[PDB]
Amino acid sequence: MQLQLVESGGGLVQAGGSLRLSCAASGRTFSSYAMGWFRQAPGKEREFVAVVNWSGRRTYYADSVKGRFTISRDNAKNTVYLQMNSLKPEDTAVYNCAAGKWDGSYYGAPDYWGQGTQVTVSSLEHHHHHH
Secondary structure, eight states: EEEEEEEEEOOOEEEEEEEEEEEEEEEOGHHHHHHHHEEEESSSSSEEEEEEEETOEEEEEEETTTTTTEEEEEETTTEEEEEEEEGGGGGGGEEEEEOOOSOOOOOOSSSSEEEOOOEEEOOOOOOOOOO
């Protein structure tokens, strides 16, 4: 059998806003795996955004999204969540949940990967203030 990841909770929100993401995990026991959120859309491949172990014992964050992103997961209810806070206009991308063996090598080739959840962050900070 395979590990089925179903991404959801994707939507549009303004720059400086926040959005909660979801991921329904089925197939293989994700409690035997570590899963990470990767993204792509503006000239991008699946880039390291965040990674979490099933326990929540280890959380890893990329400098682009660090301090303002957080991962969570209910192992009993088999559902993962991604708390996006203070979304910069650059974060407009489809986020794919990708699980398997985490090693150390930064060559981003996962064992399992999902469909992808399209999130948008409304650009233009707008504040001219004064000239």
